[PDB]
Amino acid sequence: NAQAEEFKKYLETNGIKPKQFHKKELIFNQWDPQEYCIFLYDGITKLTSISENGTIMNLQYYKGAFVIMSGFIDTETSVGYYNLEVISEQATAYVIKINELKELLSKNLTHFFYVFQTLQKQVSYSLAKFNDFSINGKHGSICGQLLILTYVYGKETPDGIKITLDNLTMQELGSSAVSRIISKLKQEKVIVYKNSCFYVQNLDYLKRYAPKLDEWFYLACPATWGKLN
Amino acid sequence: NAQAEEFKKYLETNGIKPKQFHKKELIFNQWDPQEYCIFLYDGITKLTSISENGTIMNLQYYKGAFVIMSGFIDTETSVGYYNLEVISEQATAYVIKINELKELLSKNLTHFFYVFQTLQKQVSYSLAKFNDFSINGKHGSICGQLLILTYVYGKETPDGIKITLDNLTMQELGYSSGIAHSSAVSRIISKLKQEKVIVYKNSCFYVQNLDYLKRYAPKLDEWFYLACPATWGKLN
Ligand code: NA
Ligand code: NA
Ligand code: NA
């Protein structure tokens, strides 16, 4: 992603070094008083919350390249008691104190527009998820999450759209009601297991039940949307 | 709102004037290829998506002051086939072409942060809406909406905390909770009047048990505490 590679060099040329993380590590957590701006360059993470019970909740997924900010840019304070956990085997990330970021984004508007637009993609993603769930319920959410994975990691082949993604990580991403919905799609031959890999074979099925997330992808990632359309 | 009033001045000093919009008007629409940045200074609006079927989906709500951009600041293309409908009697908004915005947010950083901060409030608001819904479902969603309406439009009266809105439609109340049809909403509200959490009296909604709403809208209450601590402190 060109605009992301440019933001990478802009951070390095300004002295900011990357950092490695491993599965189940927290890049930022809900208890640190210091808030941070995260440039997830490589890997897959998830935003998590906790209730009074101590139930963990999964709220959002992020793949690199992308930006995640745990604090408001102006006040420099938490936007919510969230933790950012790595679920891939490794993840390369740049961690920036929010105050440090603003003098940094000031001296180059192009990178400001980059970060600014990542927030926009985030807003509309959540509204398309809500829109799809409002119509086709949890079955719409699952088909949407499958549609995203298909567009991002899918390669067209004779067996279908192979999800180029380790089966470990792919099993996690996809509650008891959640298990049954995924399997029924497997039952209906929407996504098939074959030769240690998973292939998507009824892309129209996913587009049908996650139509607003299919639009979000079209309006936000047209080039990635076009390869399989 | 200090930083919002300062954004108002910056626009008027650049030739951008306010515009009156009456109820049911669309400040931007999903069919207009021109995308805009909307600085809703006063009034109440809702984001909608209209299907070919002709059904209408209520996705988000905004009061002034706030900022709603229909296009991506960089590409200037649509972020989604959405409309911004006015649901208050009148509304006051500064309507800007996206390309003209990059020219202004360039010259001032301070404002650019302001609009940047609104986006952050949107994201964390949708995630808090979602969070409270996963734990407490439709009941929590409605509690959340009532709680925010209590914080923002709360006046202490002998009949509890009066929600100072007019024509405050029960259906518009459910649309904001993420609930489409009036059956479920009617059911939930019934249990709330029975449990003496709310009362429908002078054509209007009064809150009588604030702690109850906080109990089932914690993540949304935690959002307002972190997002609008001044307004949050009114009733805590
Ligand atoms: Na934090
Ligand atoms: Na194509
Ligand atoms: Na539009």
Numbering used by the authors:
A (entry chain A): 2 to 175, 183 to 237
B (entry chain B): 2 to 237
Authors' account:
The major regulator of virulence factors in L. monocytogenes is the transcription activator PrfA, a member of the Crp/Fnr family of regulators. PrfAWT is a homodimer in which each monomer consists of an N-terminal domain (residues 1 to 108) and a C-terminal DNA-binding domain (residues 138 to 237) linked by a long α-helix (αC, residues 109 to 137). Two α-helices in the C-terminal domain, αE (residues 170 to 178) and αF (residues 183 to 197), constitute the two helices of the typical HTH motif present in many prokaryotic transcription factors. Glutathione binding stabilizes the DNA-binding helix-turn-helix (HTH) motif in a conformation compatible with DNA-binding, thereby allowing expression of PrfA-regulated virulence factors.
In addition, we found three new PrfA mutants in the remaining three strains—Leu to His substitution at residue 140 (PrfAL140H), Ala to Gly substitution at residue 218 (PrfAA218G), and Ala to Val substitution at residue 94 (PrfAA94V). All the previously identified PrfA* mutants, i.e., PrfAG145S, PrfAG145C, and PrfAL140F, could grow in this medium with G-6-P, as could the PrfA mutants PrfAL140H and PrfAA218G, whereas the strain carrying the PrfAA94V mutation was unable to grow. The PrfAG145S, PrfAG145C, and PrfAL140F mutants showed the highest expression levels, followed by PrfAA218G and PrfAL140H. To gain a deeper understanding of the PrfA* mutant proteins, the crystal structures of purified PrfAL140H, PrfAL140F, and PrfAA218G were determined as individual proteins and in complex with the PrfA hly promoter DNA. We expected that the crystal structures of PrfAL140H, PrfAL140F, and PrfAA218G would be similar to the PrfAG145S structure, since our in vivo characterization classified them as PrfA* mutations. However, their structures showed that each of the PrfA* variants had only one folded HTH motif, with the remaining structure residing in the PrfAWT conformation. The PrfAL140H, PrfAL140F, and PrfAA218G PrfA* mutants all had a folded HTH motif in one monomer of the homodimer but an uncollapsed central core structure. Consequently, we suggest that these mutant structures represent an intermediately activated form of the protein with features characteristic of both inactive and activated PrfA. The most striking structural difference between the inactive, intermediate-active, and fully active structures is the position of their recognition helices. When superimposed on monomer B, the recognition helix in monomer A is shifted up to 6 Å.
